[model samples]
Each structure stands twice: as structure tokens, then as C-alpha cells.
Target: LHKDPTLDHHWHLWKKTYGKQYKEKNEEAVRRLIWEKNLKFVMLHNLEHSMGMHSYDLGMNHLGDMTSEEVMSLMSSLRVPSQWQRNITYILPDSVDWREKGCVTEVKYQGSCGAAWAFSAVGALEAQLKLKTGKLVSLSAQNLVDCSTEKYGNKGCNGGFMTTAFQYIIDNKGIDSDASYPYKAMDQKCQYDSKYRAATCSKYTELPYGREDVLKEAVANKGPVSVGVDARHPSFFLYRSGVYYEPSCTQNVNHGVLVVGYGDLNGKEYWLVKNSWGHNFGEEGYIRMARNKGNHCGIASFPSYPEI
Candidate 1:
């Protein structure tokens, strides 16, 4: 069953990762998983590259075994907003990169965990602190995952909302640094130490729904902003490089990501987003989603930035 040389790399990787000492049944399961992955990779590659609609790459990895439903289940559970819609009266810029302004932090990986809500909140908070205090510090997402789970109603790894996580940060006075309480990628006993808190957010501001211009203005003036997206698509999972534009992308947001800035790509406007999937996916852990295009992937919905 393992006669195809074209699948040699995947076979080797699967054997190494899952162990070569697997029983016959388990070995068959691994083979089945790899076969599905290869088929999906080829289909996506043809759609994106061979078809020439968009340029990107696809590769099989740890997420190979996950079905589309299983993959979508891991996205953040952003709650539907209430009637608290506050319009921002700020000036909008033509273009901006918080990374260029020296506020954005290094790309982070969620690592088989659905704690993107925590990472998204921390990323925005970290950038806001740097902009306000002129100091860069790694804030702890694990703190929110574990400590805020009960009181703030955020699931540690299953899923969470950035708004709830930010509220926990405010009520808890502050958040500890990642160096002090590093991410374990799983739920654990709360060990929040006030002495290690690197920064705090007095409050977080949210841009009104269906307002891409307001979200852009917040990213330009403030720093990196936390946003949600519909990551339940093949283009998002196998995305490598290019401006991601799915006309059918819906507003039922799930995954949480940070919008660092925006720019024009081949006359098409795009939002520079920092994802927590790792530096191996997308453009080195960053994705340029279609902007100003009817809130593609819900980029303009539930947009928020922390106040230092």
C-alpha cells in the first residue's frame, strides 16, 4: 500500500511522528490519513496555483487527520455583540504598518490549541503597552486561558472570545509576562502572580460592525487590533503566500487574529493579519485577507484594540 514514491516524504514524516512500531491497524489508519492529506494538497495546489486565480502553496502536516468539521471546531468562539456600538470619530490614514512603527510583537503559535482568543488579546495589549510606555514585553496568554476560564467564562483551549479575555485582564488589574508564566498550550491551575504582571489594559475599544474604514483608522492610530475571521476554508488552512480573497467568505467569524496593518497588492487592497498558527503557515505566520470587500472573512466585524 506504500508503493508510491510521490508520497515518500509524507510516509517518512508520518512514520517518524507516529512511530514506526505501529500495529497493522494503526499503520493502515496513518496511511489513510496521509492519503487524504496528499489528495487535498494536490486539489488545493491545482485550484490556487495551476488555475492561476491566486498564487500559494499547500503541504500536508499535523492537521492532516482532521476533517473540515474538526478543523472548524478548533476556531475561536467569538460571542455575538450586544447593542454596545460606539462610533469612533478619528482620522483615517491611507496606509499604516504598526510593525514599522515598532509596536507589533513576534509571531506566536497556538500549537494544537484553540486559544487564539488569548493570543489575539495579548498581541493587541502588548502592542498597546509598547506604544504607551515605550517598552516591549511578552504578555501571558496562558493566564487568560487558565485563570479567566471560570470567572470570565472563557474556555482554556476549547475556545474563547477576545472581548471576554480583555475584560478579565482589566478586572484582574493586569496580566503577567510570558517569561514569568509561559504558555503550556493546555489548561492548568491558575498561577497568576501579580508581581510578574508586565502591563495592563484600562479598557478595550471595539469598532462598530461593518465598518472597515473605522477598523483601519484604529489600526493606524492605535496599534495592532484584534479581529475575528472565518478560518473554516481550504484557502485559509493551506494558504502559503498571496492576498487571500474569497468572495463567498461569510460573517460567521470564528478564528481570532491580529490586524497589524494594511497595504495595496497589485491595486487590490488587503489587510496584513498576524495569525497564531505558527511561522510555517501563510506568509511566515501572516495573512493578507481581502479588505474593503464587504467585510471579507468578517475582518471588520467585532474589531477591537486595547487602551493602555
Candidate 2:
């Protein structure tokens, strides 16, 4: 029942844009002020990008009204058990980020699909492409989903294996670029055309089960590694930042993620994982997962990678 700051066009518009639920008086007032604060900050960040000063854009989302502190706190609650590792054999660096090396592509959103297998496999292939050519190429996950089928045994969004997706790539001779086979986030009829083929893999490899040291070595020398993990936990889906570890997390294979790199947070070691659930999830669509937790969540159980 007040208009000190007053309602602005964007406030109403962004609420419409993000579908926020703000009712009641002071409830809306308190949240409105917080949203106002964040909207200004978001506008500044957007303006910076608009002025040719940055490469990324920020958007107001469902949690748009949260104070930066409240935002972190709300998401941080998902940590639940966010908990790590040992040994050294191949003499890898203390840490690495494939994103830093410019091989990994922007984080993606599969959106109402179970195609984690495709994203991870496609990501590994994307890394191999960059490492081989010194240029990053955004390959197509949709390509694998529809085309990697029949005898290779990839069932699009129903579910599949990373190794089998690689097998599909090798057998198909090459995979089309994302520009050519853009993702639709659904299972659709095959529309593959070889004219857009952008990358080729002659072979792919799999690491023996539960070998943490070898996994480290593979990321360092080969490229981003495709991994199978148990991501059904509420903590995993809601994880925003920090080293994710849940001793209660199981080893059952339900999802796939790419191990792009690994390093230590102060003294706690972690693997920098690349998630396909979009930047809104884990650290901008990545996670500093607990390393060497004796195959926590089946991370090291089904690791695989594509080789040129």
C-alpha cells in the first residue's frame, strides 16, 4: 500500500518474463525491494554486455527476487552432504579446467529429456575436435540422439550409453555440427544429412572401473572424459556451487556428465564436472564434485572418452 520507490515498467515486465509469484503486502514489499536491488545489478551487467565490454548476458529468472545472499543461501541448502581423494600415478597437475583450455563448449540444457548420455559423449567429441584443430566447435547432441540408433543401440532420449554413442559416431563416419543439427530437446525422427558432418572419430576408449588416478591422467593427456554417475539425488539437481559430495549418494547409473577438469578448493580436492542442465545448475552448469570418494555416485565407474 505504498509507492515510495514506485513500480517500474521492467519490474512488472520481468515478473511477467519469469513468472514469479509475489502476493500479500510486506511479503511482496520485502521481495520487491530485493528484486529492485538485483534488477539494477542485472541491468548493469546487461548494459556492460550490450556496450561491447563483455561476452555474456544475464537474465532474471524464477529466483529473481532473492537477495544475492538469500539466493546463495537458498541454493546452498541443497548441499545436504556435499563432501574427496588421494594418490598420484601419472603426475598430472594439481588442477585443470578444460573450459580454461577453450575445448569445452558453453553449458547446455537438455530440457525434459534423458539424453545425458548424448551430451557427455558429444562434449567429449567436441573436446577432441578442439585439441586436434586448436579451434572450438559446438557439435550436435541432437545428431547422436536421432541417428545413433538400431544396431549401435542408442535410443535417443529414452536412454543410452556414452560408449555406444561414440560407436554410432565411428560407424556413421562423422557427426554433424550443432549449427547443422541444432538441439530440439526432444526425441524426433532422424533427419541426418552427411553434408553437414563436422567431426569424425576413428576410435574411443574406456577406463577401468574405480581408477581415479587414471581418470585424472586421461583428462590431462586425452581430453574431457565422458562419465556415468548417480545424479538422482535432490542435492545433485539443486546443487549450485561448492564441492558436491553426499556419502549417501549411490553408485547406480542414472545420468552422464563430462569430467572437464579437476583441482583443489583450499585443501579439499574436487573434479570440475560439466553438466548439461544449463548454467542455472551447478557452477554455471558445472560442479566441483568431490574427487576420489571411492567412486562416489558411480562417477568413475563408467568413464569413457573419444580419441581422434
Candidate 3:
């Protein structure tokens, strides 16, 4: 299950296996339905599986496409800014690209699981690290999964609230990487490595009810912000790339992405988004939604800010 989920082979297999379980167990059929089919659970199942596979795939591709020397050069280019929340110029491509203006860039997937909270926090911080120092670098999502204080009710392939998850990172002084912490998707471990880790940034703040206020501050200050998105709308899964112009309603947030930029395209104003699903998945690792989508799933949590 270390592989990512794709629209092909992997999904087919998940449908068969999970489908049988549904029939045999006579379980929550409603939960398993996806767009008038019994594949809802399977789709959700694959989202996590696909995400991890995608991340590993991207990592492999990134590593393969670039030589060690190039990666070294890229890492050397990193420089965390003093005030990432206030220094960011634009969340290019959308909210998901919040770090695009930072020193480095990375978009990782957590695999067939609900580790959005972990990925969301790590993602924002990693970008913040680069913006702060002008040095782009990747961090470990697994580390957050294993160490964060409030255990997400879901697995690495499941879901959780981004608000509380971030607070856990700040409280713990920061987290490490898979190289140092690894993953065992089933167990909820609480291992601490504060001694050997980099000192946590004191400005890493999480606002449970302050999502709106934070956005106001970011918009006023011109910085970067973090927000969760609901990708559970029927349009989300059926959206298999191409035709970026379409209107769809997501019943709930099935996936989480970052709002990195904003602008007008073809007379329509939209929010630039960064999806962990990969470059091939959307508008080259992005999706343009009406800026008015509001904070439906924490979309407005982090408003337009230069430094966020």
C-alpha cells in the first residue's frame, strides 16, 4: 500500500476488494456510495492511497529528473525568511502554492490515508522555512503524524482538522522527518525528538476560530496563510484533468489544499490552489476556483498576506 492511487489499475483493485467487503458486511452503504455508485468508500480509500503513491512518484521523478548535484544545488538555494507571514508576495497558482514565492518548493502526498492535517502543517511550515531563509527544503509529514499531540481520528490516509493539528506542532517545538521518524500507519505513536531537532519557530500560530481574522490580517499585511479545502464534491473526483473551467459543488471537503494565489482569468476571478495530488492532476499542480468559495473548508482561514 506504499503506492499512490491512480485512475487506473490501483483503483480497479480497490473497487473489487472494498466492494466485496461492503456486500459481505452489509455495512454503511451510504458511506460507500460515490456519485450514485458503491465506490464512494473506494474513492476515499484511493484518495489516500493515490496521494502517497503520487508523493513517492513525485519524489522519485524529482530525484530522477535531477541529479544529486542539482538537488544539492536546490537545497543550497534555501533561505528561510525572517517573517514568512509578511514577506510572501503572491501565492502563485493559488492557495496551495503558498510557498511558491518562498526560497524552495515542494508538494508531497501522504498516500491512501487521511493525513491532511499532518501534510497541511508540514507543507505550510516547510514553505515558511524557505521564505524565512530564502532556502527551500522539504520536511517530514510522517514525523508530524507520529509526534503531534492531538491524534487525528483518522490514519495517515484519512482526515483530521488542520487547526488543532498545527497547534500540536507549535507546542512540540517542531517536528522531524521520515528519515528520523518513519511511519506505521496503524499505530498512534507519540515519540518525541525535540533534543535533536531544529528549534521551533515561535511565530508558528494556529487560530481555530481566527481563520477569518487571520485572512483579514494577511490581506492587510500581505502575507501567506493556511486554509483547508473540501474536495469531496462530486466534481472533485470526476475532475480528471483538462477543462479547468467548470462549476461543481463539493458536498464536503474530501481533500485539503492550500490557497497560494489569486487573480482574474477570462473575466472570472479565482483563487489559485496547490493540490498535493500532483502537477498532472490539475492546472499543473493547481486549481482555479472562484475567490468567493469562502472559507468553506478553511479556505479563508489564511487571507491574502505577503509574509504568511
Candidate 4:
């Protein structure tokens, strides 16, 4: 579902009906925004009543399992609202530095045919290239999608590995963003960029079948990483107005995302996740995955961190 500010209003209603589940489930998500990002007045399910109800229901459904894990992994380890914050810092390019050295313009890619994995991986590499080499680079996703042949689940649109995509770009040079060669079907002639997109990656860190080490790399090193989460839940698909508590459901697993950052919250651990659905999806168009449970959702792919 879409984000909505009004969903905050119904938080109490769901809390009253589902009791702790509704409260606790969404509490974790909100805590990330409140503590980690320092954003207030955020809602997860606000726009439509159906979405609000669906989010509440999903949170309640998955609250027990998610809470058990949260308690066992996070709460047991640390207190609420961590006294100190732990963040992974990276060297970011400054405005002056870009002006002096010339920063590359960003290339936007449309996730045509549900190719979020490819688009995100390319976006990450694009950013990484700028950060690493100070040169703008456009990476290709179609090459990885068509060539990788890794075979996870989604072939063209459904799902793929950001890490693998990274590796493909690194090994095969790379492809440019849509601006270079607009997106088309596989049947269409693939347009390869003669001049590489400014950035490029040295290599991708290898990850276990279900490990988040790749995300760790992205946190420390600038690059794009893929994460599959439980987005199938009703609250996830319904368009809401603001950030609010969404009920957990099996449906939340149908979608994938990008891991952009990582840190500790109230002594608990979490990852800064970037989503492609849009800016209104989660916190600034992103979501924080409980570090402990992220792996279970296939947050493992370590495609390639495009080296500029």
C-alpha cells in the first residue's frame, strides 16, 4: 500500500483490537524512522481505510513471529531508544569536489517489466562509480539479466540478484542507463554503450545463500545491494498517505528492495533499505530491515558494486 499521514490516526484502533501485535509490529518500523532517521509524523497506512485495515491485519498476523525474533535478537540485547547510535560512515563526494572534478549526472532507470533488480543494481553502481572515481558512469542491467542466467525466481521482471548484476558489469565492462539506450523487450536489439558509464566496480563480495554480508559491504562501501522482503502483505500494496503501522502478512515477501545503509537503533541492529516502488513507499522511499531477519527474506544477493 501507499504511504499516508492519516493512517497514524487509526493506529490506536488497530492497537485496541489486535492488542500488542499491532503496536509492537509497527513500533519497530516507526522506531527506525524516529530513532535512526529522526523523522516525525510518519504514517505507514493512511490513504485508504482498506489499506489501513489491511496493514493492521498484516502486522497482527506477523507480529507474533516478528516480535519473538525482535525480543530474542534486539530487545534482549539492548534497551528501547539506544543511548548511542552506531553508524557505518562512508566518504561521500562533496559539492565543491564535484564542481572542481566535475560530478557525473545521475541516470534514472525505469523498472520496466518489473525489472527492479536490474534497475536498482544499475542505480547503485551509478552512485558507487561517482563516489569511488568521481566520474559519472552508467551501468547496464539488461546484460546482467540476459547473461547472468543465475536463475533465482523472476527471470526478466520477477526477481534477480543485484550482486550478480554488479559482477556482470564489472566482468563485462558495463551498459549505460536508460538515458543511453531506452528500455525495450529482450527481443529488441540490445544497445551496448561504447563509452563506459563513468563509474565501475573492482569486484563484489561473495555472500552465503541467505546472508546479508552484501548489505554490510554496501553500508561500508558505496554500491547497490538487493533485498527481497515481505511486501505481499495487504498494507504493502495498498496506497496510503503517510507512514503508519502495517499488519504483517505473507504477502510482504513478494517484493524486493535495495540496502543503502545500516546502523543500531536503541541498541538494536537494522539496515537502511532503499525501495524502488517510489519515494512514498517507506521512510523517504525506503525501509529498514531488521538485520537479524533480513536474510530470511533472501537479502543475500551480492551481484557487483560497480566501480567507477
Evaluated with TM-score, which candidate comes out highest? 1
What's the ranking of the predictions by TM-score, best on top?
1, 2, 3, 4
Model 3 Cα shift for residue 96 (angstroms): 11
The lDDT values for all models are 0.78, 0.74, 0.44, 0.44
- Position 263, candidate 2: lDDT: 88
**lDDT tens string, model 3, 1-308?**
12233434634454464343335453323222221242443355346547643111111111112223332322221111112333223322223334446632455544344565555555556656665666555656666556553353323334454444555556666666544665454336666576545324444443333244345344324444455555543344334432233234332334555555565554555555666644544456666655544444435533221122
Candidate 2 or 3, higher lDDT? 2
lDDT of 2 by residue, 1-308 (tens): 23335556667776777666667766666777766665566678657667955323445554456544443322221111111111122277888888888999999887655677888899999999998888899888998888886566666766667777887889888998998899997788777788998899998877767788889999888879988777755446545556777667786657778999998876768888998877776578887788888877878777779875
Q: What residue pairs are clashing in model 1? A: none
Candidate 1: where is the Cα deviation over 4 Å? 1-6, 13-35, 38-51, 55-62, 65-73, 76-91
Residue-by-residue lDDT tens digits, candidate 4, 1-308: 23345645544454454443325556645532322111121233232345534222112221222323332221121011111321212242211112123322333333234456666666665556666666565555565455544442325543454555666666656556555555553423345665744345566543334445545654454444544555533344332322223334322233445555565555445665565544434454555545555453444432224454
Residue 124 displacement (Å), model 4: 2.9
Q: Which ten residues in a row have the lowest lDDT in candidate 4?
A: 74-83
lDDT (10s digit) by residue, model 1, range 149-266: 8667687888887878888999999999998999988989999999998999798887788798888888887788898898877667767677887666899888899999998777
After superposition on all CA atoms, what RMSD does each candidate show versus the true structure?
Answer: 3.3, 10.0, 12.8, 14.1
Q: Model 4 Cα displacement at 14 (Å)?
A: 24
Return the TM-score for each candidate structure: 0.87, 0.73, 0.56, 0.51
Best by lDDT: 1
- Whichever of 2 and 4 has more TM-score, that candidate is 2
List candidate 3 segments past 4 Å from native: 1-100, 149-158, 182-188, 195-199, 203-223, 240-254, 293-298, 301-308
Distance (Å) between predicted and true CA of 96, model 2? Answer: 1.0
| lDDT, residue 109, candidate 2 | 82
